Each structure stands twice: as structure tokens, then as C-alpha cells.
């Protein structure tokens, strides 16, 4: 290897992954607004938050996809965008040893039909995505809180919820109970300005408008 430090890239798998791109694009052109392959040979199709079940069910039952292995569903809060939240699923194919990723946009008041019908593995995945992020999922068995304090208010994983929090706990002898109080830190998280001031890698340079 003349370049034993950089990761050697693979193009043959990049081709069929690109080929499977327009494939799923042509099968369901109602929802797939954008299909994108990564330089890490990862496939990412971009769909609409109304036809998630069709596109998810099709990928699950297709004899040419069989992506029955639901890895995880998550959100990436991007407050800049009009649809700040972004529900993202990861699927794996046992027969095709490949992973594809579906990405949708969503706002705070736009429900998503629950993906329990297509991948009922996720029953607990909504229970945290509505917990940490707050995105409600439409027509769901039980959208309950299983990842925060009982009676906690807000959605901590958002970018408006501070890392410090809003509630601090202390045992008081007046009430014989661990009672809540507003947060108050002995020391504060020193915000660090790590981002470099000069231009990084020129590849991902957003053109000015």
C-alpha cells in the first residue's frame, strides 16, 4: 500500500449501492425526494414524513431489499432548518449484508405515523425519541416516558434545554423527602471556543449566496 495511512476507498460496492439508489427512487417516486450515497459507501434516501410506512414496509418486504434488521431510529435537532427535528432510521439486510438509512424532516407539531407497524422492534425507540427530543409519533401503542425523571418537564436532548438542567435534587429534613430545587452549580461548565478560526477542509465549502 503506497498510502497505508488513509483509508482505502471501495468503488465496486459504491456502484451497486448507487444502483440501488435510483432503484428505490424509481419504485416509490412519491416520497423519495433525494437519494444520496456517502464516500463511506453508505446509502441514504431522503423521504417525506407522510409516506414513511410505505417506504419502510416496501424495504422490509421487498425480495430484492429484505432490510428487516432495524438498527435504530434517532433525531438530530438542527434549529437552523424550518423542520428542526430530523427522524432517522437505520436498517440492515441479512441477505445483502448492507445498511441503508432513511432520513425525514419534522417539526414540533407534525406527528409521524408510528413505525411500530413496519418495525415493531422500535416500540421503545419512540418512547425515548418523544422523551429526549419531544417529537410525538402518531397512532402509537404507548408513548410513555422511560428515559428521564418522573414528572420531568421538557425535552433535554433539544438544543434549547441546557446541559446543566432545570431541577436539582436534595434531601430535606423538613419534608423527609428528596425535594426539587432550581439548579445551582458550585462550578459552571466553562464554555470552550474550540472551533478553529481558519478555513477547514475545502471540500465541504458552502458556496455563498
Amino acid at each position: 500500500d503506497t498510502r497505508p495511512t488513509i483509508r482505502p476507498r471501495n468503488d465496486v460496492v459504491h456502484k451497486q449501492l448507487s444502483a440501488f439508489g435510483q432503484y428505490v427512487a424509481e419504485i416509490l417516486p412519491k416520497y423519495v425526494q433525494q437519494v444520496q450515497v456517502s464516500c463511506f459507501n453508505e446509502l441514504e434516501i431522503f423521504i417525506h414524513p407522510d409516506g414513511v410506512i410505505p417506504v419502510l414496509t416496501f424495504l422490509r418486504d421487498h425480495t430484492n431489499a429484505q432490510f428487516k434488521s432495524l438498527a435504530d431510529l434517532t433525531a438530530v435537532d438542527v434549529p437552523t432548518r424550518q423542520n428542526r427535528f430530523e427522524i432517522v432510521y437505520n436498517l440492515l439486510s441479512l441477505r445483502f449484508n448492507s445498511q441503508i438509512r432513511v432520513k425525514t424532516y419534522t417539526d414540533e407539531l407534525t406527528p409521524i405515523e408510528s413505525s411500530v407497524t413496519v418495525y415493531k422492534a422500535a416500540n421503545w425507540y419512540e418512547r425515548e425519541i418523544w422523551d429526549m427530543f419531544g417529537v410525538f409519533f402518531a397512532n402509537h401503542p404507548d408513548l410513555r416516558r422511560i428515559l428521564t425523571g418522573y414528572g420531568f418537564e421538557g425535552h433535554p436532548f433539544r438544543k434549547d434545554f441546557p446541559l446543566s438542567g432545570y431541577v436539582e435534587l436534595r434531601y430535606d429534613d423538613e419534608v423527609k423527602r428528596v425535594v426539587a430545587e432550581p439548579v445551582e452549580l458550585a462550578q459552571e461548565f466553562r464554555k470552550f471556543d474550540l472551533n478553529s478560526p481558519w478555513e477547514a477542509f475545502p471540500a465541504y465549502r458552502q458556496p455563498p449566496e
Binding site: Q34, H48, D61
Partner: protein, 115 residues
């Protein structure tokens, strides 16, 4: 077509002693639900092509032992599985009908994530 497979491996998946005929009738049904779908649909132009090729392929070779690798689909006890839900799959998009153009284009700056 030889000794019946008492243990297919994967638990729960039964071993039907009539794998061939089940495969054909199933493929007729999946070809049936592919009948009403219009010609321009990408579902048809792609999935009937594999179906009749596989339907023609299962019909030609009548022995299970070799047919496992002719269709390559593992064992015969599960090739009817993604096929039967392919029959289901065609039924689901008898409703969604997604060959129409995009429902609406995404917001102008929704994608493209350097920020």
C-alpha cells in the same frame, strides 16, 4: 423430493412437504396482484421480471436440494416468506400508489448539512 427436512434450523419456520406447488401457486397470486398495476409503474417492470424468471426457474427444476441454490434464497422454507409478503407488499401499494411525482419538494434548506 427426498427426505423431509425435520430441522430447518430457524425456529418457528415450518417445513412444508409441498414446497414446489406452494411456490408456484404463491407466484401466481403475486403475478395476479401485479396484473392490475399499470404498465408504467416501476413495481411492475422490476418485480414481475424477477417473479416470472423465478417462477420459470422453480418450474423447470423439480428437486428441492438443488433449487435452494438456483434461487440462492437460503432454504425453501423461507423463500416463500419474502414472496408471501411480496404478495402482501403489492397489496400495500395497491393503496399507497407512489408512482406519481413528489408529494411536495422538501424545504429549500432542509437537506445539505454542512452548517
Amino acid at each position: 423430493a427426498g427426505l423431509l427436512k425435520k430441522t430447518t434450523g430457524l425456529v418457528g419456520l415450518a417445513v412444508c412437504e409441498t414446497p414446489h406447488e406452494r411456490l408456484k401457486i404463491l407466484y401466481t397470486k403475486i403475478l395476479d396482484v401485479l396484473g392490475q398495476i399499470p404498465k408504467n409503474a416501476a413495481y411492475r417492470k422490476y418485480t414481475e421480471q424477477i417473479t416470472n424468471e423465478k417462477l420459470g426457474m422453480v418450474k423447470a427444476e423439480p428437486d428441492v436440494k438443488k433449487l435452494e441454490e438456483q434461487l440462492q434464497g437460503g432454504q425453501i422454507e423461507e423463500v416463500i416468506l419474502q414472496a408471501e409478503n411480496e404478495l402482501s407488499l403489492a397489496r400495500k401499494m395497491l393503496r399507497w400508489k407512489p408512482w406519481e411525482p413528489l408529494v411536495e419538494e422538501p424545504p429549500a434548506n432542509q437537506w445539505k448539512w454542512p452548517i
